[PDB]
Amino acid sequence: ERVLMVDEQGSFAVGGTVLVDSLGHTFHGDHAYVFYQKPVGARKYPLVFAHGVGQFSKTWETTPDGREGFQNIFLRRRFCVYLVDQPRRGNAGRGTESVTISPAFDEEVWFNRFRVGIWPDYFEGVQFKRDKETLDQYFRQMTPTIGTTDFEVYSDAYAALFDKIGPGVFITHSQGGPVGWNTLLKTRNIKAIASYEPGGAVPFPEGQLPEEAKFITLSKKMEGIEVPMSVFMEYTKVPIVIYYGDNLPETDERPELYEWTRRLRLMKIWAKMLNDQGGDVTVIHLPEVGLHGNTHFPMSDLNNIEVADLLSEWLHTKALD
Template identity: 50%
Template sequence: MKTIETALTAMSLTLLAACTTLPGESGGSRGTSSTGPLVIQEQGSFAVGGKVVSTPGTYNNNSPSAAGQTFHGDHLYAFYQVPANSRPLPIVMLHGAFQSGRSWESTPDGREGFQSIFLRRGFPVYLVDQPRRGRAGSSTVATTTEPTPLDQLFFDQFRLGKWPAYFQNAQFDRKPETLNQFLRSVTPNTGPYDAGVISDAMAALFDKTGPAVLFSHSQAGGPGWLTAIKSQNVKGIVALEPGSGFIFPEGEMPAVMPSAAGPLAPEAVPLADFKKLTRVPIVIYYGDNFPVEPTTERGQDNWRVRLAMARLWVAAVNKHGGDAQLVHLPQIGIRGNTHFLMSDLNNVQIADLVSQFLTSKKLD
């Protein structure tokens, strides 16, 4: 692999990031991006996992039909970058619902996201578009995608505020163009959501990367746990606000949790599979602006039950000898975070917490 020089010439690949401090309405750290060239030694993209579906019959070159043809689908798309003098363990970043690998790239207001932040810290980074989403849109199962208006629901559910007002301390830039960029990151499913299909493809990705750390966001929590069960190459998990797919051992299921946003139900797996989660260190982070007691506010009560279920999940992992922890950011004095911790105004501060975890678990 040839190192890509950072001279400002036509033959160079130089990614510059301005050092900026952004204003906000809350107290906490806003953080600054590193300045100067980001030196990339290698980058590329590929598909992995999935299956090939065949149609019976014989293909006719001059009168083509479905007969005798094949269809490649249900794979994931991965884009990777390896910085110069990289650390040994890559980071694989898996997005949440209605999102793509875009979640980890530049923030809606134009700062560096977790992709660049952790590249600067020396980690190879793999960004994933999960099967049936984004650049991995070939689904072997049909669905119907409708142009359903959901912008205001997302504003509430992702805890920017209560439409049309932002939370007073929300770590989100208030410029109209920032909200425009945020809402344009929404990406529909091209096939039914299937945690098994996603985790199968993710396990195939970890076969390719070798040992690596998994970062998951929101809906990716469930597929993330399943990926760690299916692949011994998952060496640690950083889960940002897991929203569904909380798996428990058969016979140890907590009760379904009702909320103003609908019930949250646990999912059962064999105890032998669940115990595979105890071999890796896990940390879960949740942000701010939702209560720990029931409320009629849909967008906030949605996260109350997810935090409560996550606490039970962490206890279950540790009960079986695991190493899991949960950090509720307001309890450690970090306030205003939305559902998108990795792109909030204080995302460098959040990345610092993650880096401390990685160091403490010898994952860096």
């Protein structure tokens, strides 16, 4: 019986490039696609949401079991909400590269990687509905990259978006993490960043890469990267919060899950190093603040309203609401 009072809504492509062939003909690609809604009585700073690998805006929309996601929850709380499909993903599938896409039979691997459970079993107490239809939805919210992964291309489009809409808050997920870290260096208009379970390319000062950053992922990439000191200092300039969920394993028997344990450890080190240089980085491991059973997608888990309340609280204390 509640009602979302939408003052404005719409969609647009943002950013991208233009290829030009030998005849002067154009190809417009590599933009992001954005759908936005502005509530009546909107707060000063919009929220911009960025998904991770294999996913799209649906990350933040209806949950796989049919409940409201952050798109609806934050609109109801009077934030302008911008949902994005990054370059080469979903509705932004018009990339600039030639590419071959083939189905991969790794759905059961993703179940584990997302810490829903160890397939075929769900984790005890997991904040995820256990029926077949929910899982059907969960696998069908994946969509392929129509090209190669390129954080420069991705972050360029998000910078173009922040430049367009003005100062806002960037809410990211997983590989959205390093998209976020890159985008910060490209726009004045990011006021703050909240990231859910970031992974990849954590920036440390050259010569100060912590031992805990030197592990190489399953994706064959080193987790931490070295950046010049003046670039590292840019991450001290806005408030940052990072959230990790539950069922982080204690041993490395299954790297698909243990990588998340390593990431929690690493982000705490990263936060400490930035805070020692005057930053404002908070890392929250959800069970330690009373929320148990979260997966890699806390924004769509069964307790996602409680997850949203934590975010609203932080936004409030940073005067971003």
